[PDB]
Every structure is written in C-alpha cells, then in structure tokens.
C-alpha cells in the first residue's frame, strides 16, 4: 500500500541499496505533515455522521430526480437511500484513511481500483459522488494546513471520478 | 507491503469502522518517537559492511569447518554468496524499522529461505547465528550513548532484536 | 542524478499518474533537512583545504610504506603526493555535493560508477581512502544535526570502499 | 534528470570546484521559497480534471473543424488521445514546478514531439493554443489569493509561465 | 477493420499459410448474409432523420432534468440540442456501417474505442445513449432477418455502453 | 480445442475407420437445427451486460454477507473482479453452445477455478449460485417465442443447461 | 484442431471478445457449405477400397521400379504392397475427415504435421503419393460443388507433399 | 487492413455522410459477383506450388546468371529465399483478391520490398519478371473454362491482373 | 558438465588435496587410449540417420500396436516426435563417450524424462528397447574392424554400452 | 563460417572474454590436422572429374529410370544429365573446401541451408545424391588418416541428406 | 566471420572453382607458421592488464586535459569506460591474430565506432594513440627473444601491427 | 566446467547438432596437450611446499608493513600468517587443477568467482598474491612446453587480480 515510507522502502528495494539519506528526509517529512493530517482525520471522524447526512442531501438537492426516478440505481426507496448514505461513509472513511497513512494507498486499494466498472455496471453517475465530496470540502469546518490535508485527499478522489 | 499506520487501516477496514480515540493517540505516539527511530535506522546502516564482516569473521572462527575443503563457506564463490545472504539479512532488518512492521521482511526476505538452504545444503542452524552476531553489533551501535541528544529507546531496541530473532527463527 | 526530488518525480513517473501528497510530503522534509545540509556543506568547503592536508597525513602515518616504496600507484614523488591530494580533494568536494543536492546522487554519480574498476586498475588501496575519509569524519569539527548530515555522506563513501 | 539543486552540482562540478557563498546563499533563497512552490503543484494538481476539460471546451469551441467528420480530434480514439496529450503535457509541467528545472520537460515530454504530430498530421498550432488555455487556467487557481497566507509569489507564476511557454514553443 | 474477410485474411497471415476452404466458407456466410444487411441498413438510411428525432424526444422524456438543468453536458440550450442530436446521427450512422461492412469493425474504430474516456471527461451519461438506441431498435420498423441484423449491432452498442 | 465436428472425427481417427451411415445422418441433424443455435447463442450475447448485472443483483440481495466490510465482494476491486469472473463464465459457455461442446469450457475456463478460489479465500457455493442465476436468465431469453420463426428447441436449451450446470458443479 | 467454427472461437478469444455478428456469419456459411461436404464425404467413403485399389495401381504404372527394386521402402514383396495401400487409405480417410469438420484441421493434425521428418527418414518419395492422389482427384466420380470440395483438400494434400 | 466494403465506409466517415443509393447499388454488384470471386481464389490457391516451380524453373532458363557461381540465387540458401519470396508474393495477391482491395497487398508485402532488395543486392528487374510468370500462370488457371458453370469473369482477371502488375511495378 | 578429468578434480577439491602419482599416472592412462575414443565418435556419428532408422525398423516391426490407429507411434507427429527422441538419445550417448563421463547424459537428458512419458502415456519399456537396438548396431559399427589401425579397444566397448544401458534402465 | 578457429574466437567472445589456453589447443589440433586434411582435399581436386563422371553413373546405373522417364527433374535429355553432373560437381567441391577450412562451415553454408526446400521443389529424389556420394567414399583411392578426413564430411553430407 | 582458409573458400566458391595448386600450397605454409601464430597470441594476451594499464598511463601523462574536471576521462564511470574500450580494443586484434584475418574485428569493433565517439563527444584522435601505445607493447612482448625457440618472426608482426594500424584509422 | 572437451560439447549441443569434425580437431588438440601440461602440473605438485615457503617470503620481502601493522588482515600473527601460505597453497592447487583439465574451468570456478568480493571485505591487496605468483613463475623451473603450459595458468590468475 502506497505511503512515503513504502515508497521509501520501495524505491531503495528495486535497486538492491540499503536506505540512503535520501528516503530518510522523505520520512521525516511525513512525521513532520502527520500532526497536521491527524487533526484532519480525527475532525472528520468526529463529525462524520452530520457530514454524510449533510452531502447526501446537497446531491438529492442538486440531483432531485434521484429520489424520484423508479429503478434499483436510485434513492428513490428505503433501500436506495440506505445504499446512497452506506457508499458516502465508504469515501469519507477512506479520505481519514489516507490521513492517518499519509498517502494515497487506501483510496487507491479499497476504493478506486475497478471503480468504472461498478459505476458503468449498476449504472451509477459519477456527479453524484462529485457533488458529495464537495459539500464535505466545503463544510468540514477545517483550517490551516489542517484544511490543506483533508481537502487534496478529497480533489483527489474527485480527479478518479472526473 | 505496509508500514505500521497502514496495518492498523487494513484492520480497521476489515471491519468497516472509522478510527477510535484510542487508536489515534496511540499512532501519535508513533510520530513523536519517529526522531529516535530515524537515528537507529541511519547509525545501523552507516556501519552496514563493517556489522557483516565482523560477525562473519566471529562465525567463521567459532566454525572453522565452514571455510574447510567440502564444506557449505568454502570457495569465493560461496564465500560471496554467504556474505551477500547476511548483507541482505541486514538490508531488510533496516527496512522493518524505518517502517515499524516486519511484512516487508517477511513477505520477501524470509518466506521461502529455509527451503533454499535445504536444497542448497546449507546449515541453517549457522545462517541464524550470523544473525544473531549481527543483532548485537547492530543494537550496541544504534543505542551507542555518544554523540546524541541522551534518552530513553528501551523500547525500539527490543522492536529491532524483535526483527532479528524473526529472521534467526525463520532459518533455525 | 538521485535527489529526493528527482526520486518523488521518478516515482509519479513510472506509475504514470501526477505527483500525490505522498511525494509532497518527501520533498517538504528535503527542504526543512537542507538547513543543516547547507551548514555543513559550506564549513567543509571553508575548512577545506586544512581538511585535505590533514586527511593526506593521517594516511601517510598510518601507512608510512606509501611514501617509501617505488612505483607511480605510490605517493613516493612530487608527482604521486599531487595525485594523492588531489584524489582526497575530490572525495570532500563530493561530500559538500549531496548536501547540496540533499542526497546520494552526486557520490554514485562521479565517484562511485566504475570506482572498483580504477583501484583495480590502478594498483590503489581501497583503505587509504578510507583512513582520509575517517579523519575527516573527527576533525570536520561540526556539532548537532550538521554532524550527522555531513557523517552520513561520509559513511556512504566509506561503505562504498568497504 | 536534474533540478534545482543537481544542476549547480552539475555544472560546478564541470569546472571542478567548490560551492561559492554567492551560491549557497542563492540556494538557500531556493528553500525559502519553498513552501510558495509546494502550494502551487498542490493547487494545480488538485484541479487537473478541470484544467483539461475547460481548455478543450475552449479550444473545439474556438476551432470546430477539428472535431468535423475528417479532421485531427473527430471520433472518441482520437479525442481521447487528444485529451490524454494535455494530460500528460499538464503532468510534465508540474513535475518541472516542483524540481524548479525544464530537464525532465525536456528529456521525457516535448524534444521528440514536434516531429511526432508531423507524422501524425496533427496541428502543433492548435496543440499549443491548448497548451496557452491551461496556462491561464493554472496560473488564476495557483495564485488565487482566497484562503491561503498572504505573500508575494510573482516570480514563481513567470517561472510556471515559462515551462508553459517552453512546451508551447516546441510545438507550434 | 475488423470483417469476417478481413478476419479470414488475418487468420491466415497470422499463420504464414495461404487461404484454405476453411476461410472461404466464412467470406461466402458473410456475402450470403449481405442481403439482409443491406437492406437493414438502406432501410435506417433513408428513415434516418425521422429515427434520430424519435430517439432525441424519447431520451427527454425519460430524462427531462437534461432539458432544465444548466450546464453544456445538458440539452438546456440551443447549443446542447444540437449536439444531441448530432451524437444520435452517429450511432445510427456506425450501425449502418456495420451492415455494409458485415462486422463491428466500424463501430469498434470510430465510436467504442475511447469511449469511456469522454463519457467521463464530458460528463455524458451512458444511459442516455442507451434510452436513445431502445427507440431505434423499438421503432426502426423491420422485419425477418434484417430486423435480426440492425438489432444485433444496436445491442452491441448497448453492451458497449454498460 | 474441438468442437461437435471434431470430436466425432477424434473418436473415429483412434479406431482407424471411415465414418458410417449412422455417423453422417446423426451430424447431418446437427447442421439442420444450426439456425436454432445461432439464435440462441446471438439472443444470449446480445443481453450479456443484462444478465451478468441482474444475476450479480440477486446474488447480493441473498448474500449481503459478500459486501460487508471484511467479506470475499467487497471494495471495488473485488467486486470488479466478481463481475468479471461471471462475465467471462458466460463468455464461454456461449463459446461452447456455438461449437456443441464443452472443451473449450474445460480447457480454457473450468479447469483449475475451483484450486483458484480456494487459494484466494472465494465461496465456491456462491460463485456456482451466480452462473445458476445467470442460466434461468440466459435460457428465458434465449427461449424467449417472441419475434422469430417458431419452432420446437427444447433439446437446445438442456444443451445450454447442461454447460452452466456443468460451470456450477467445477467450482460449487 | 483447425475448423471455421473453432477458428471464430479462437479469433473472438484472443481478443477477449464474446462473439459479434461477425464470427455468426462464418459459421453460417459453414453450416450451408456442410451440404456439399457431407455429400463428397459419404461418396468416397462409399467407394473407398474402388478407389485405393485403383490409385495404388496408378503409383505402380507410373514408377514400375517401385515394384521391383529391392529394399524395405519400396513395393517389390507382400508387406510393401500392403503398407502402400494403408498409407493411400490414410490419405483418402483424412480427405473425408476435412470434409465432415469443415477445415483442414484433421489432415494438418494427423497427416501434415511432421511429414517431411517421416518422408526423409523411411526414404518415401513425395510424387508416389501426388500420383495417387491424383488419381482420386480424376476418378472419384463427383459432380458440382461435392467436386469443389473434394478436390480443395485433395490439392491442400498436393501442395504439402510439393 | 480493409476490404471492397470497409474502404467505402471509411471514405464515407472522413465525408459523415451516410452511403448513397448509388453506394448501395454498387456494393450489391460486389456481393453478386463474389461467387465468381471464390473461384478464382480457390482455383490459384489450389496450384499454388506449381505456379511458384514453373515459374522460377522459366526465369532461371530465361536468366542462367542468377544460378550461376557468384549470382543472386546461388546455393540452396538463396535459392530458397527466392523460391520463398515468390511464394510470398503469391500469398498476398491471393489475399487481395479475395477483399477486393490491395491495402493488406501494400501495407504487409509490398512496401519496404525494393529497399531491401537494393540492400541485399538483388534484381529487382528479374523479381518483377518472375511476378509477371506467375500472372500468366495464374490468370490461365483462375479463368480456364473447363469443370464450371459457364459465365463472363473478364473485369475479375483485370483486377487480378491489377494487383500482379502492382507487386512488379513495385519492385521493377 | 564435467568429464574425465573435471571430474577427478572436482572430488580431490572437495578433500583440498594435491593430485597423488596414482591419479596422474591413471589420467595419462586416459589420453593414451584417446585415439580410439575419437574413432569411436568418428565413426557412430557418420551412421547417425542408419543407427536411428534401422532401430526404428525393427521396433515397429516386432511391436506393431506402437503405429497401429489410436497407439502411443501413430499419425507422423507422434511418428516424428519419437524418431526425434530416438535421435536425441543417441546424439547424448556419443557426447558421453568423448568426455568419458555420463553428468551430461544424466543432467540434460535422462533426468526427467520417465516422469516424461509417463505424462504423456508413452510406453517407457519400448523406447528402451529402440534404445538397446541403437546399442548393438552402434557398438558393432564402433568395432567394426575394417579400415583401422588394429588393436583392442575391448574396455572402451563397454563404457560406451554403460551409457546405453543407462538410458534403457533410466526409463524402463 | 563454421571453423575450430571462428568456434574458439566465438566461445570467447560470447563471454566477454580474451582467449584463454582453452581455445588455443582447440586451434594446435585444427592445425595439426590439416596435414591429412590438405591431402584428402588436393587428392579430390586432381581426380575430380574421373570421380564426378563415376559417380553419375553408379546412380543411373542404380536409378536407370531417371535416364528414361519424361520430365525436367529426371536425366532423360541433354540438359538432364549436364544438370546431374553440376550438382554431383557442387558436392564433391563442397567436401574439399571443408577440408581446406577444417570444418563443416562452408557446406554447411554453400549447401544444406534450404536443402530440404530445393529437393522438394524441384522433384529432385534424395537417394540420388546418396547413390552419389557413395561412390566417391568407396573409390577416392584414399588411405590413413586422410581418408578419415575425406569420409567424415562426405558422410555429414548423407547424413544431411537422410 | 571467416579466418584466413574461410575467407579463400569463399572467394573461390563466388567463382565456382577447386583450389588450384598455388592456392593448397600457400595455405600449407599458414599451417607451418601457426606455432608462431599460437606464441603471439598466447603472450599478448597473458600480459592484457599491463599493455591496457601503462598505454593508459602514458597516454593521461601526454594528454592531461582528458582527466582534467569537465574533460572526455574524469569521473570513474567516464575513466572505467576508457579503460574498458582499451580492452575491448586489444581483445579484438588478439581474435584477429589466431584467425589470420580483420573480419572480426571489423565486424563487430571497429565499424560503427567513430560514429559512436562522435555522438559521444570522445575525441577520436586521443583513442588512436592509445591503440598505437597498446601497438608497441603488445609487439616487443609478442617478439620478446627470451625463453623461446629462436626464429624469424618478421612478417607476423606485421600482421599484428596491420590490425592495431586499422583500428587507429578507424577511429583518427 | 570450462575445458576443450565441455566446451566442444557445448558448442554442438546449443544448436542441437551431433558432434562434428570441427569439434574433434579441438580434442585431438586437448589431448595431444596434456604430455605438457601433466609435466608441469606433477612438477609443482611435487615442490609444492617449497614453492609456497618461497612465494609467502617473496610477499613479506616486497611488503614488510604486512608482518608489522596489527590487525587480522595481516600476517602479524601466526594466525595471519597460517591464513597467508593456505591462500598461497590453494592458488598453486588451483594452476595443477587447470593443467589436467585442460583449461581454466577450474581456477574460474574455485577462486576467480566472487574474487572481488573477499578481497574488497576483508581488505586483502590483489598485489600481495601476484608478488605471490610472480615467485612461482620464476622459481617453478621448468623448461620447454612444461613452462609454457604453467605460466599460461599463472598469467590468467595475475590478469583476474589486476
Ligand atoms: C579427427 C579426430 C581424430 C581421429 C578420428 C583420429 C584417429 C586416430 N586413431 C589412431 C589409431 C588407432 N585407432 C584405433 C581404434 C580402433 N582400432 C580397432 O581395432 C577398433 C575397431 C577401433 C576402435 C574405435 C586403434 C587401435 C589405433 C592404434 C593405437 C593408437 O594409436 O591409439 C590414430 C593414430 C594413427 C594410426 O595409427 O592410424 C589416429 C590419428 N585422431 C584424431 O585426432
Ligand atoms: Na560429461
């Protein structure tokens, strides 16, 4: 799983090197970003059932014939709500995820790894999980390099769906 | 392969839960011990030819029949091969540390090493000695209390004879 | 040439996707290490002629066969004691490189590549080098992370003769 | 490939001396101006998508006939290839920002290029209005003074101008 | 392109051997099955513009947020109206292609190949195509096996988009 | 690989002998009910997306256990490779159905899936529920009487069961 | 073995394709060539010892030193002459075979495939077996397309012994 | 590579337009005549060897130098590559006539042939000549009127002839 | 590989000794009696094709189920494939002769080649006996005693039928 | 070319070695050898013409159909028998240049590469030019080693040729 | 590649004619002089690191600005490379030598090799001195009259000085 | 291993060929060798203690520092120097090795093969064991083909160490 410090093994490890002072400031750097990106992810975690309530809205507001619409891909019943609600608390527990490994490695493994073929298959629009992930950059409450973290985990996800 | 932050996620995900309060705090200690964990890594590798041929050297004194006619250090070619073995040993202890997890010396150093020495014929009741020998060169020099801010890594140390034993087990 | 930021660029590169947090975060730690980098590079470069007369006596005195024993591998001449300084002259020079350029590229680089080659070739010990290089590791007269800095380096080049 | 720092080296080295203190001291502004540096690619990097897609818009909106039945962006093969050498024409640029040197722009991205949509029969023209779109568009979401510490950053947005310039140049 | 007698051609080349009786049987299939083909496809080609106004009104009605909804992937503008139909008049005109060239060599080359990168890029739901090519197969106004034939490439546009 | 054709010619090339009366009659049969299988296979093929998808659906309604965090279709990467595993199932039996043998199902497909899965850690029982979905779908469409000659084609469609069993039992 | 219903199997297999309207034609034409085939087949099997009996001779008259030299590769004692007539009825009894399986992928599996190792080996000359099959050619007694097919695998026999 | 039917489509998208009733009509002649067309394939396919052997048997009876101590098919090891050349030559135009069209002619065979023949050392004047041997041969045999249903195939032999003439005049 | 000579060395390094005069003494012993080792060569490689061949013969004539339909020399790819096994077990059997050892007989050969044909289903006891009719008429054309320097060549004779027996018991 | 001295020079230069005393002896015995091997190939050359008619004739004597039946492949005509006596020419001048070079390099060139293509082509029977051979290792008039010599390539021609 | 009886044969095959006289007893005296040809070539080669070693010393000593910083043998990677091309140099006119013949080292060192120092930036007239110093040495060696049978030798020398001239020109 | 008769063995067997003449030249060579190289091979096994006395002494001659400077590399122990003359013993072994096998396969496989890497860790000069050798030569006292044969071993040995 991707993260400086398998990266920093990893790029030591295919030239057959022990770890030069190169990969150590690499490292340094990452423990040095940590206290920023854990006050991020523990922010998150904290308000993270009103920020699920909160953007699966901000898309039924943006997107209204989602609830409306008949078919299994909408919320338009019980079941398609619960489903719309269960896949926001997927992406936003994968951006702390990416926090606390400070890396992309599992919203890359968990989540974006065959995430086309799901959306072409069950016929899911890729706007409506643009339109959630705005609402939480927006709204997460965050600021300072704090806010820098959270929200180029979450322009990252959005660049995999646009 | 993983570090430590990326196994508690991997945990964590198996199943389906955000972080606790507990498990954060605890992976913030890990970033404040970051510093003496770096040093060890930096102090370990800097002295990387001389913990080898040292313990080798010890080994092949303490087993005189290794190097003998026959027998499994004799010629350069094997000789070679014996040392390049124990620097390679080395190369993913170092690897474990920097990262606080051993799968990176599990997943490719030790799975499938005691097989290769029995088809070779290779004692490795000698290879893990090696080791052992390299532990405490290694630990003496990264714990060395000269030139350094003084303090407590009690801890780490015990985390790297962890890795080492790991090895010495794998191939015993 | 193998830099911190050369290897976050390398490292995007090959997996064909635009540079992550994960590769910022290394190259952050590069830019708070280079301090102390830029500290011990530029009192080596002061001190360095008082260094390299230094370094090329150590050896002399350990080795005092050198200067005695015929032939042109020998620092036995005018000529020989020249190509003796000179040579030690090259390995600090390097050493204040990778400071520079906060890593090992500089060393492997023009010193390294083919440097078992020329001893070989050449007739010249490989622990001559070694005992300039360890004088020069106690005698550089640097304290706290602009130590460590400049002994790393150091070290590297010592492991590469051993 | 070289950046900032390796190229000094480079060309020091050439000449085979040491470092002066007039440079030291210009690397040293080097570091300073770090943290402007990192914010840029962070910035630029994190609107990608956008950048590309709002530039194509433009330029088959400026241009119809390239997307005309026969001309060079008609059918999704060629479109998607269209889109993907802005990508990647984008993706080069900001591994130049971070390094602060047009080698790795150089060497991987445009020497060879020219030559290639000459074969191909693709407008370098129009390549590099592509390119001048996602300049402007980079340059505004880099330099947008909303929610970030306020400071001067007019000479690292010249440098940025440069390398959009340079691929521009090497293909019109 | 891909067709049974270039398929038949590649077979044997791919093999260094001259064309067996193997290969002529399916170039006579292919020029058996012509008849039907062609006139599948001068039946769309004259009832084209008809067919291609019938599925632009039947993607609206199924999806009226694209009529209302602002934005330039949306049919909310004289503009978007425009290039609607324009996207329709290409789908029937590579299921055409097809007939006349008795394969998905046509469709494969100009239409599918890249698909799923502008769709994502241009932010173009696939359904929207799919309502599109439902009404030409529904109202195309076949019969036997020429019905059999213009079907047969329409589904396999249909597969291609989910 | 072989198909009705071949076989017949295989088994006939072992005992050294020209074909009998009995053996052209019977393949005879075979060519005249040939548009009754190229129907159904075209019908099939046709409506592949459909049955993979609706299949998976139902799947999943009855297994939720598969989705949940931990459990072996959950992330997207797994659940990708459970529609690709179905997809490519259903690829072959439509293969086999052409031919009128199973060989290229057993060579190709079946052979050494059910060793795979329990490698990986995959239900077997759940894969073999799928291609079972997957064949009460394939066979109503396939059999479906509307908008085609009519015609008797129950023989056909034990055939086409008997390829998606035969899937079901490899790996069930 | 080689057919044209295997053939549009492996071409759509390669590529990692269901099968298209493409492969659908050329089985087609196949099973609407069948009818010739299976008619040319059951007449030679019909007629067979006629005819092996008939091109033995032929080979005899055309090379009599064939039936009077001596050694173990020729046909001048009882066991010669019996391996003569197996090998021609092996000949014959393939052509049959590519005719039922539509291909030349029987006589290519069991006959082609290692002929010219065999031929060289047991000092067989290839223009025995041209005269034999000639013969067939000339006398089997077919009409129409049953003829064209016939023939096509009986020259495809031709061509692999010259 | 394309055929009589896939030039058509190509010309036709380059333009967006869908096929003319005059476009419709001439390809339905195509269809027509492609029993005629099969014939001929199957015809010169069928004598493939012969025609490559009495040629080249005619060519170096019209041309000894070329067998000749020195000349440029002497030994078995030129004299094969001949032979396999004329062979090849022959496949190609087979393959073309068979699509109506010579891009698999041009693109696969033809171009880049003269080249090489420069390079090697070859005449590509006697080439051309043992082209033109096999056109003769194969015409005669293709359109020989015995054992077939009587009909006009005079167009069929000139585009035959065509594509003979192509291969020459590209290597003459 | 090794041979006669490697061989003697590779086991006196083993113990770390010196020749003794009985090793030297027995080695020059060796290439005394090299003439008729080379004659020995000479003469079975110039009847390779009549050795195979007339081995062949007599095995499918005393075992006519091998080429009857169904049976494991039947159709002339199975037909090749043993005459090609039958070659190549004599081409192995004559580079052990001239080396006087069988490590290249046992490594690239032997080894691996019963667990061979029983994966394939080929009689292991018939290609022994093609091996031991090879034996006899290699042998008697070895020691044929026409046209050469007369004199005994009796303990060569059988060095060169240990190796033919070697192959027969390797997979009988 | 195929000589103990271009094998000695390719075995080193595949390893990237300079020739060692390995390769030496391998050239010492080539030059060794050639005093019998410059007999057998000067012996040849002055009886070339008498072994070239002699041979020609053991094989129509042998073959006597080859002088009656019609055909070109067959001596049944002037040009037959001038075309017989030229290849029977080629072979033996083959065997000489192998002997002047010390190996089988040069009929290995000259001759066996595309043997197996011309013979199948051209009809010519391969026993004929066994038949050939034959008669030149049985009445070259050789004797020692230089018949060893001579024999050694004239039967790696019939082994090439079987 | 030919040596000096391969290249005689080739000649007169391209003629189609038997060795005369004169060309039989021009090669036999080839055969008379190889022990002179063998002692050449056996001392050069036992003395390669030293002829290499001191022709490079010389040449550096007469043209310092090669290892000057910036200049085309500073570095170790650039130094390695020289020293290495020097061996390569002398490893081909040593292969030359043996074979009596420059095909070798035409083929395969020096054609495409000024074009190579050229792109390089390697001055060519600096790489011809260094082959002419390796000349000197490798001939005094070669022609060295201590402990060895005494006799002319004039002419090979010659030879060896033929091939270490070409490679200079080659390359000036 | 490397010797004439593996190598002739090996250059047939990589292009599938049975031995040739070529091949058999190289061999007689071999063995037309081996009168000289088992001379000189049983003349230095003989006097092999008294060469290794000789050579060890012509080492501490030429370096005097390695008797005096402490350290476990050097001979400034019995132990140091017990290590020295077994060194020394087995390169003579090694050059006995080469001469009856004909070839440099032994002293390639025992010693040469990972040469470079002893020496580099456990800091023994390369020129300390050519002085060694050096001596041999010299002293070994043989004459002709004998000294010949032994020197060529020796040389091979002080070419791998510089
Ligand atoms: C090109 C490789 C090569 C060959 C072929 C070769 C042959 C060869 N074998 C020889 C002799 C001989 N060869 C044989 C061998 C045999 N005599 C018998 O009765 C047995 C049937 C047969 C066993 C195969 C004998 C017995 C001698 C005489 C004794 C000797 O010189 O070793 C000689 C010495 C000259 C002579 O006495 O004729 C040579 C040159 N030398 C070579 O360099
Ligand atoms: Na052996």
Chains 1, 3, 5, 7, 10, 12 share one sequence.
């Not at chain 1, 398998?6 to 030591?12: F, M």
């Not at chain 1, 295919?14 to 992810?41: P, Y």
């Not at chain 1, 909408?74 to 896949?87: F, L, N, V, W």
């Not at chain 2, 070779?120 to 020099?141: E, H, Y």
Request: with cysteine.
């Amino acid at each position: 799983m991707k993260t400086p410090i398998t990266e920093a093994i990893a790029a030591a490890d295919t030239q057959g090197r022990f770890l030069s002072n190169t990969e150590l400031q690499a490292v340094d750097g990452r423990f040095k970003r940590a206290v920023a990106s854990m006050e991020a992810a523990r922010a998150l975690t904290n308000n993270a059932q009103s920020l699920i309530d909160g953007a699966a809205q901000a898309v039924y507001q943006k997107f209204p014939y989602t609830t409306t619409m008949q078919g299994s891909q909408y919320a338009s019943t019980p079941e398609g709500k619960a489903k719309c609600a269960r896949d926001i608390g997927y992406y936003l527990r994968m951006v702390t995820y990416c926090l606390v490994a400070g890396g992309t490695g599992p919203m890359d493994e968990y989540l974006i790894a065959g995430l086309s073929e799901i959306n072409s298959t069950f016929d899911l629009s890729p706007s409506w999980y643009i339109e959630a992930l705005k609402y939480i950059k927006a709204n997460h409450g965050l600021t300072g390099q704090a806010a820098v973290e959270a929200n180029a985990y979450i322009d990252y996800a959005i660049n995999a769906l646009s | 392969m993983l570090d430590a932050f990326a196994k508690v996620v991997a945990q964590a995900d198996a199943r389906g839960e955000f972080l606790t309060n507990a498990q954060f705090d605890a992976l913030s200690n890990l970033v404040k011990e970051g510093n003496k964990r770096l040093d060890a890594v930096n102090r370990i590798t800097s002295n990387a030819s001389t913990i080898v041929a040292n313990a080798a050297r010890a080994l092949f004194a303490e087993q005189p029949q290794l190097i003998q006619p026959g027998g499994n250090a004799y010629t350069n070619r094997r000789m070679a091969a014996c040392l390049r073995d124990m620097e390679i040993i080395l190369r993913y202890v170092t690897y474990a540390i920097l990262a606080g997890d051993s799968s990176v010396l599990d997943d490719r150093c030790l799975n499938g090493l005691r097989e290769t020495y029995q088809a070779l014929g290779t004692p490795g009741s000698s290879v893990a000695v090696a080791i052992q020998k390299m532990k405490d060169a290694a630990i003496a020099i990264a714990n060395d209390p000269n030139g350094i801010t003084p303090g407590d890594c009690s801890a780490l140390m015990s985390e790297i004879a962890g890795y080492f034993d790991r090895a010495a087990a794998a191939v015993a």
